Design an enzyme around this catalytic site. Structure first.
Site: not given
Length: 279
Positions: A39, A69, A161, A224
């Site tokens: 990530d 994130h 998403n 996520s």
């Protein structure tokens, strides 16, 4: 073990019911397992990781998470307060730059890196990879996730998403990996959560409190963020010897909480990640 006043997501995965605040888990807590967080990187210095987190690979000038994130997803996997597997080892693979973007080639190389790098790590209980990323469909990104899965890593990926069928998103649409949709604290499918036959499990995805850069914390939403729950859960289950990397996703779905999520579109699994821990 019992972590009181845990994030609702942790409490949910150890509960047959929503609306509890205590996370219950075997104290082995993923010890001897490893979770690669592919990530934006991990702020390994975050006190929440207790030295169990570390950057092992970056494709940018820095391995530091300048986004937050990846640190947030690593915190949901194995941070002491916000993590599912509170004693797992966290390995950061920074395939996303500090706006959280990344070329598919970089993401693919990061997945191939994990498939090899796990042979450079001590993970006797098994290896998990958390992929809290996604874009349009790419057979090469799907195949990269399948390779990572085939290598003996549990690959958990975000459904996306988009409030769409995850068939049009990668690596969400790769069937061999574990595609994770997002649910909220009221056992509703997160309004943004992708769905479809490719989803294998839902995790807590809305308003997930976890670590953030600057040694801080914050609550953010996304598939996520359901993903590190399932990734941490697998690491937790593999340490317990309940399952292996090849079978973790199938095992989590078998042992998931069934038919408790609402607004699950027809054809999408109504399965919520559940550690089945009996204290």
């Amino acid at each position: 073990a019992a972590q009181t006043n845990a994030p609702w997501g942790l409490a949910r995965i150890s509960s047959t019911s929503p609306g509890t605040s205590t996370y219950y888990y075997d104290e082995s807590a993923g010890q001897g397992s490893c979770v690669y967080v592919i990530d934006t990187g991990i702020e390994a210095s975050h006190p929440e990781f207790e030295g169990r987190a570390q950057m092992v690979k970056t494709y940018y000038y820095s391995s530091r998470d300048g986004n937050g994130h990846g640190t947030h997803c690593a915190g949901t996997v194995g941070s002491r307060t916000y993590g599912v597997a509170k004693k797992t080892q966290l390995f950061g693979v920074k395939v996303l730059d500090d706006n959280g973007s990344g070329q598919y080639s970089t993401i693919i190389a990061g997945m191939d890196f994990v498939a090899s790098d796990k042979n450079n790590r001590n993970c006797p209980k098994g290896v998990v990879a958390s992929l809290s990323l996604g874009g349009g469909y790419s057979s090469s990104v799907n195949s990269a996730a399948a390779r990572l899965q085939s290598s003996g890593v549990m690959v958990a990926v975000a459904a996306g998403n988009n409030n769409a069928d995850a068939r049009n998103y990668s690596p969400a649409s790769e069937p061999s990996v574990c595609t994770v949709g997002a649910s909220d604290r009221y056992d509703r499918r997160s309004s943004f959560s992708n769905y479809g036959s490719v989803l294998d499990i839902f995790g807590p995805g809305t308003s997930i409190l976890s670590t953030w850069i600057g040694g801080s914390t914050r609550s953010i939403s996304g598939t996520s963020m359901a993903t590190p729950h399932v990734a941490g859960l697998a690491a937790y289950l593999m340490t317990l010897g309940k399952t292996t990397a090849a079978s973790a996703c199938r095992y989590i779905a078998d042992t998931a909480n069934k038919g408790d999520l609402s607004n699950i579109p027809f054809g999408t699994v109504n399965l919520l990640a559940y550690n089945n821990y009996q204290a």
